[PDB]
Each structure stands twice: as C-alpha cells, then as structure tokens.
C-alpha cells in the first residue's frame, strides 16, 4: 500500500521485481507524465532537494547536476562526461520536503536529465511509453530503499571464503603462473583465499573450455591450489565462439539458441576468440542450456565465476567491418583530400559497440521475436541469471561466488558487481557508487584498479578492505611488503565482522554500505557528505583518497572511536567528539571509526577466510554495549538456524 | 653567489636566463651524474620530503609519486595519467632537511621521475647530455624561488584592461555573433572588457588576415566595440596557410623564412588551414619577419592576442598522411583478417603530433640547421618573443595583452599563457588551482584556465564555481569547445549569480592589479603555496588545495558538486569574506585552526589575514570606470595596505605616485 504501479502501454517483462503490485488507477502522484512523443516524467525539484540512486553511474551521492543515461556500455575511460556506464539500475529517490521513490521498469535506452538542463527540473524519459513506473512512500529515503529491497527480492549472497582477498591480472597463463602466486603470497605469510583465471585458461578462448596444452590435468591441480586454501576462479564471456567441431558452438547452432538477424541467420559478433555468436539470453532454453554448461567446471572443483563482456560487447559485426574496409578503402585513394584522417578514424571507433549492430540481431521470447536494442539492458542480466539458475538445479544448497559486469534490477539476486583506469579519483568514485548500489540491490561489489605507483595500490586495498569483494588487478613487486601484507591483514581480521554484517543485512532485505544521510537524517552537515560511508550499525569508514596526504578531514555525526589498525599489528584508538575533524592516516594504517554505544569483534590475523580464530575475538568500541554476530559454515544456505545469531558484550 | 651551473657537453643557448652565470668547476653538489644511457641526474630523498615546481604540468602542488616529462604536447584529455602538456618548466626545488633547487636547461624531451618508480628516488634523465644545471641554495623553498626569479629576468606584465573580464568561444564568425555577446553582457550589466576572436575570423584561417565577407570595415567594427569598453582579441596559429597569391605565405617561402625538411623543402604540416608551413621560430630574421605581421592587426586597433597550436600541433604530415593511406589500402583489401581494426585505428592516431613528424624538420640559425625534435620545447616560446619584441618595436611605450598555449621557461618575459583544452570537469577546477602556484615558480605569473571547462558541456552551477576561481585569476576568461553547451552567462537561469560572481572580480581588480603589479616588478610571487608563508606550520605545508595571494589574503576555491561549503585549515587567525549575491560582504573571525566553512553557489570567499587589510571598490562594469578613489577597507582595525596603481596602459612602472599608503 506504501507502493503503486502506473503502467504505460505494453511494457516488456523484465522480471525486475518478485513481488506483484497491482496497478493502479488514479493520477500519477509526482510531476507530470506526458505520452506526446515517447515518455517523459517532469518533476519540479525544490533546492534543497537531494536526489538518490541510480546504482552503478558515474558522479555523485547525490545526482544532481547531471545527465545519466541507462545504457549498459562497455567504456574504459570513466572519466566525469561519461553518461553511461555498465549498469542499468533505474530506481531513484527525491530526498527533500517532498520524499518519494521512483523505479522504471524498462528494459531500454532510459535518460534521467537530473539538474543537467534546468537547475530545479528532473525529467526521466524514454523513447516509447511502455514501462512499469513504481511509486513508492515514506517518511525518508532509507525507508523507501528497504520497501524497493523487499518487493525486488534477496539479493544474492557469496559463500564465506569470497570475503577473504583476491589476486587477479590479465596475462596469466600457465599452471606456473599460477604457482608462483601461491608460494608468492603463502611464504611471505600475506592472507589470500582466491586467484582469478582471466581468458587466457581457456583453449583458443573458448567458454567451457580448458587450454589442454597448459593444463593436462586440470581437477587435479584444482585440487593443488585448494589444499592451500586459494580457489580458482575462471571467467566466462557472452560470446560463443565460431568454430566448426567446437560442441558449445555446435549445439547452439543445431538447436537455434544464438541470437539471430532479420533472415533468421545468426548473427556474427567479433570479440576475444574472433568471431563469435551470442547465446540468446532471453530464452529461456537457451538460458538453460547456456548455465547447464558451468558443470565442465563445477564438476571439476571450481567453486565460482565471473562474468564480463556481457553487454554485450562487439569490436565489431562483419557488417561493421565490412563497411569500415570500403571506406578505409576510398581514403587509401583520395588524393583531392575530400577524405579527411579523423573521419577515418572516426568510423574506425564507430563499429565498436555500434548502436546500428545492436539493431541487427533479436531475441527470441518464447516464440516472438524481439529486436535487441528494445530490450538491452536485459543482456547481462539474463547472463548471470543463466549462471544462477544453473546453480540451482545442479546444487540447490550451496552457495557459489558469481559477480557480472552489465547489469539491471533484478540482476542482483543472482550475482555481484565489479566496477572496471588506475586513477586517485577512482577511489573516490568507488566509494561513491557503493550505497547506490545497495539501495538497488547489489551488495556483493568491489573494484579493480585499472601505470600504478605503490602509494595508490595501498590506499585503494585500504579501500577494498571493505567492499565485500576485495581483489588486485601485484602485491609482492615493490618496496617494503609488509605495508601490502599489513593492509589484508586488517580485512582478515574484520571479515567476522564484516560477513556477518553483510548476511544479517541481506538476510533482512537491508544496506551494507548507507549514505550518512540514511543514519542521520536530521543532521544538515550530514546529509551532505559524499566521501565518508556507514557500515551496518556499528562503524563508519572515510578512505583516504588523495596521494601525498597524510590525513584527511571528516565529519562525525555523533561522537565515535577513532580507530586505526596499525602496520605493527596493534590497534589504536581515540574517542572524538561530533563535528569536524582532521585525522592522521598512515599509508600503512587502516582507519574506521565505531559509533556511540556501539562494538565489533576483531579477530587475531590470519591467512585464510578458513583459520580464521571466532572463538574468543577482541572487542572493540564502547564498554557495556553488545554485538550480534552472525555465524554460519559459509558454504551452505542453512541460513534461519537460532544458532547462526550470537550475542557479544564488551 | 648563491646559484652555480654546472655545464654538459655543448647545449644549445635557449636564452632562458638573461643574468649570465659562470661555469663552476667542481663536483655537481647532490645526487649523482651520469652519461652511459644519454643522461640522468639521480638522487635519493629523505621521506619527509616535499619537491615543488615544473609549472605547467599535471598533479599536484607536491609533484612527488608520479612521472613529468617535459615535451610541449597538445593532449586535450588531461588526465591524471598523462606525463606532458602544453609547457616545458624545467625548475625544481627539493624541499625538507637538505633543500635545493635545480634548472635544467635543456630544450628537448626530459624526464622527470620524482618518486615513480621509486618512491624514495628522484630521477631527471635526456636522451643527450647537452646542458646546463643550475643549482640554487637557500633556506628555504620560497627564498630560493625568489633567487631563481631574479636571473630569468621580470615577468611580462598585461596592460590592466588584461584584470577585466573576458569571453570567448570557438565559433564566433560574424559581426552578429559579437554583437550578440556585447548585448548579451551589457544589457543584463555583466561586467566585461574582452571579447576572443577565435579562428573563424581569419580569411580561410590564413594567418593576418580577417574575413572579407564578414567583416568588410573591421577597423570600424574594432572601434564600434572599444566604444563600448569591449576589446577584440584575436587568435594567431603557428602555421602558414600553403596557398597561392597569399603573401605570408609567399614572403615566408621567397625569403626561406619557412622551417625546412633535410634536402630545403618546405616541411609541410596540416592544422585547421589544411597544408601549412611554420615559421622558423629559431631563425632571428625569420622572428622579426613574423613579429612584424602582427602590426597589420595592431593598426587596426587591436590591442592584444593570444597564440595558439604553437608546440607547433600537427594533426599530420604529408608523409604520415601517406603512410596511412597505403595502411589503409592495406586493411581494405585484406581478406583473411589478418589486418585489425585496432591496428587500422592505432595508425591513424599514431600521425598526429608524431615523435617521427618532429624529427622530419630543421630550423635554421645562423646558417647551422638542426633538427626540430633537439629544441622542440623552444618552438612556442620564440613565437610569443617574436611578437613581443615586435610589440616593443611598434609601439615601445604601450602594453599589448599576450598569452599563448606552449611555452619554456624564458617566454614568461613576453606573455602569459592559457592551460589549455581542459574540460567541464569538477576536477579541472582543483587542477587549474594548483598550477598556479606552480606557475609563478617559474616567472609565469599572467595565467588562468578556460573558465566553464573547454571541452564536453558545462553545467550552470560547474561555470559558477570555475568563474569563483578565475576571479583571483589574473586571466579570466569563460571559453568554449566547438559544438558544445552554450556556456556564455547569458544562456542559464536566473543570472543575477553570474553578475554577483564578476562584480567580486571587478570589486577586487584594484587590489589584484596592484599584488600583480607589486610581485612583477619585485620579482616575487603572486600566487604561494600555504608552505612559503607557514615554513614552521607542519599541516600548512601539505595543503594543497588552498593559496596564499599577494601577502594579505588566502582562498579556498568550492569544487565539489553539490557542495555548500568545504574544509579549510588556517595557519592564523583570519577574517572569512564573502561577497554576497546582494552585493554587501559579510565577514567573520575565525581562530586559527581546521574550519568548515558555508559557501553558496552564488557566493565568493577569501580570506584576509591577521594584521593585513584590502581595499574593495563598488562594482564597476568595466576596468576604466572603477573608482579607486575611495574604496572600503576590509579586515583588520589598525592595518595598512600600499595600493600600487599607474595608468594601467603605459610603462612607467618606477614613480612614488605609483604608491598609495592607505590604513584602516
């Protein structure tokens, strides 16, 4: 009754909710709609409004100011111009006078022009009306996000040794690779649970496959990293191969699970592996069949997965290069100099990610046809469901690490985020985009850093000691290690803590990560921070972002326990009273800070998510209060037990 | 007594320094020197460490953790990974326990890597050890940025118009799009007192030339503006139109005035013309040649310019042009996909502003020819003496305004610059900030950045909070990429908030005139880092992102987005100002101390030191009519501020009624 449903000619079902809202038959409470050319919702913005959401995009907390554009986009440079990142998540919050929540549910190209135009004007459209548009009450924003987490269902949840640490990097490739890693980290005693296989694993770069020169004997070897606790975890990409005898491309041939062209051919999209075809996402059988195939590494010990390139990306269709040689080719010939250089160089930019391709093949909806434009933003989404969905059926009680880098709402009961250049303002950007993720539901999320000096790597893991996925994109090629094994020791010995959070606020359809204007709604100072983060109930976090800083300013809402883990293993606290504050942090320091009346468990450092020691954890924070810490064997869903709650008191 | 070069193998004579120091005979002082891969200096920092300088370059006040390498490059995207933007400012200075400062002059592609590969290692390498070291002691980073000022010689000085505001945009073409912005300012009584000519004003964009068409009696039109207290400044490129009957074009090959290839011929490079050659920068005839083209505008009226594309900027040659046709003819015919589209893609970003371009090129001096790449920092630097000096020739008692995009150290004599094609990023604002500071390290004191952000589109409140920082700025000046948001002030709502923001500036532009005036002719710094005037303060020596001005005030530009104030550490006790939007100034003690501070949108703050005072007048809609006669004091009861002031159009900078000692 706190949610309406206005629904606007034949919307596409995206599946985005779980929760069935009626429609609703009264004018539209908000603004104004209008259905003249296309949709357009116009909303007059008082000025001291706030504007939450959008998830993965690009700025601020706060939107306001700008143009975003829900277009999942594969764009490597993020720089503040960009209108569309990897993420469609279209739910935003009006957070003023007037408090209320907006989610569209539309599978395609949708602009929010927040302020860009017109200082006080909102104006969220698209180019045809048919959508869903969610309305949604409350007496303020952080109660309107948990009505959307609810009727948008749990979100996804990792098993316990995907909040230990990470190491990734493109360019691995054989099992020595591999090794030198393992001694790497475990003889000088750093903590680290997972290693990422980037494409180079697999055979001529095809999904389900393993490179069989390079590894022989893959279960076993599996099983030689996971007897020192670091699991293997392999990508998996949108695009199928071309190749005759390859059976993934073979069957998706036969049996008509490619996404096709207008004549029923299907369509060549050009990535990693050349030519390639696109499972058709969005039907169901191909779904199927796609996530059925995750068994080739499940069955041979791999324990997760991540998902990239499922925009899905194109370098190039053959039409595309098709029409770039004929041009190249009349340049190649121009003598009057009628044919400019940055026109050639502007088509040979053009036919990457081409607008015009994603015309050119469809899905097939359960016998309709769709064009694939109309529906986009569902790509991705459907990838990881595919995964998820597969899962299921194959073991219903066990949880595996999934995370995708494109994305819509309802993306997020399936699997995480990743967010991909190596910049001191990325951190801050990171920061930023994690409460709006969780407001849309994506909780299991991380960054990767992107040309990288010692000083930015350590306070981006500062960082990423506290986004649920925490892993490099290495630690051992500088000076002075012990600042890089001092950093991951401060996530180990958070991650009770830290899981524990991240399952009671899952569990509870809640907020990992909240904007200080969530936690403290009626502090005007508060509301306006944008560089410092609540955790659960009980901490705050404010990284340093700037290089060369030796502390930074922050504000406290309340008074808080300044703490800090120090490189020497020690950890320092101070109690600081509400208001401004400039606070030294160390590049080896990791700093936090507990609230009034508050505590967490800190466990003693250890080297992986496995032999880390709960029994009798140190408590940290104000005497006389308690915790409640949650606790489960982290590999199954036995998640309702009494048992898993218990009650720690300082 | 207090600076020392040291010599390496024969360098070429950049005339960077005008006081001539003797070679010194003994070991190099810091680090080490070595020859066996071209050449590097080496030397290892104490952790506390702070290195200061290179003017235009990117980062931070504090350039330790990254690498510089000065190579004037025309790069519109500055992001933080890039090493080489549009100057060349080869003047460091280690600041902590063991402090020092060191000038490499040197006029090719050097290499600064201050803590990047190694965080306790400072590293200046060359390909060849051909030049001079000055190396400059002192007791600290500030006094020996003053030393360092005194023997590059007085900064170029900007008539006191140069203080007005000023608009621009890369599209403006006929007397009605100028006509346009005049009303557009006048009538809604915005202060101004320039407006840009872009290139669309030229014939074809041929070099000292204007539009036929479009501007048939531009001496008329010059005046029709000045009438209005609104003066043209128009744009000059490096490069010469190739085209038949065009005279610059004609003179500059008869006359072998044009940088050539090896065998004599003409290089040719393409920039908006289309084929151009370039003048010979380095040749002193062809200098003279060139400066002397400027006087076809000057009689005209015009009473300033600005120099662009002079690294020089080639967007091809003809020889890359080549090459990339036949790459081309290759990837069409290629069946068996063997050619990329990203190798296709790289080839044809790879002609512009190529390494290879700059090999292909001579200048000529004195008969003895040597290859552009040698000297190419030199090149935007002798344009911009090439008019200067045709300035003094023309008209020896008058101030002409001057800037240019590319520079070196030694050009700061003869005009300003511009930083450039930034963008409407929020970051810009912080980034522009710090160079400044930077900048008047290295004598360049006549700066400031595209106001609004050059390229992509700016929003209302983006050119509000980048139009507070140009305020201090003693360049000013909103400008414009081609096809992007209208970012005139006249284009957004209620603008009432542009007019409050420039009326600080005119409000101010007695007392900025004066501090710039001041620091020039004493060799001192307009802009200082917190550092310079705190030495003891431990915390006031990290702050980046706030400047001390002259020697009365500090600011602390808003640029965040969103944001309604910001943090702020002050090392003493200050009075917080204000100009509010209804035009009084509001005015607040705050203790020494870490402070947050409310600033609105339509709102400009500085702060007036413990002690000091400035004097503020009305507002005022263009610099003529601003009465200095009696403006308020601001600040501290008790205080005195000595008010330098001239005609602001001559250079008779020596006289005692220059001088006004006002008190509070």
Redo the contacts between chains.
Sequence with gaps: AMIRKYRYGAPFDTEALTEKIETAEEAFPYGEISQKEGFAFTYIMDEDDIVYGLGESN??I?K???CYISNCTDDP?H???KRSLYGAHNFIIVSGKTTFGLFFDYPSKLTFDI??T???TLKVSCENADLDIYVIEGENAYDIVKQFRRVIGRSYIPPKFAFGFGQSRYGYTTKEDFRAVAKGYRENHIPIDMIYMDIDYMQDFKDFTVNEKNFPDFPEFVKEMKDQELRLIPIIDAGVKVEKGYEVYEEGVKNNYFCKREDGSDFVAAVWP?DTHFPDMLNPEARKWFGDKYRFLIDQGIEGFWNDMNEPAI??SSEG?AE???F??E????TE?KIH??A??AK??D??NSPEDYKRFYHNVNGKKIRHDKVHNLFGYNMTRAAGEAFERIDPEKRFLMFSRSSYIGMHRYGGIWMG?????HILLNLKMLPSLNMCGFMYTGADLG?T????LLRFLALGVFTPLMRDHECYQF?NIEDFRSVINARYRLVPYLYSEYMKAALNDDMYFKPLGFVYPDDK?AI?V?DQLMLGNEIMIAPVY?????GR?V?LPEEMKFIKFMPDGSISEEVLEKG???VDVALNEVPLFIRSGKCIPVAEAAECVKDIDTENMQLIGYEGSSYTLYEDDGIHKDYDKKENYRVLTK
């Excluded at 250049?421 to 303002?425: D, I, Q, R, Y």
């Design positions: 700025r601020g706060n306001r100011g700008y440079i720089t503040e111009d302020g860009y017109r200082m006080d050349g370098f190039y290069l770039a040689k004929e190249a080719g340049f190649a010939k121009d100099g250089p940055w050639m160089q040979m930019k036919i990457v250049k190596s910049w001191w303002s040309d000096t010692r000083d930015l000076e100072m306006r944008e700037e290089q060369n800083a030796r300013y504000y401004v504050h400039y």
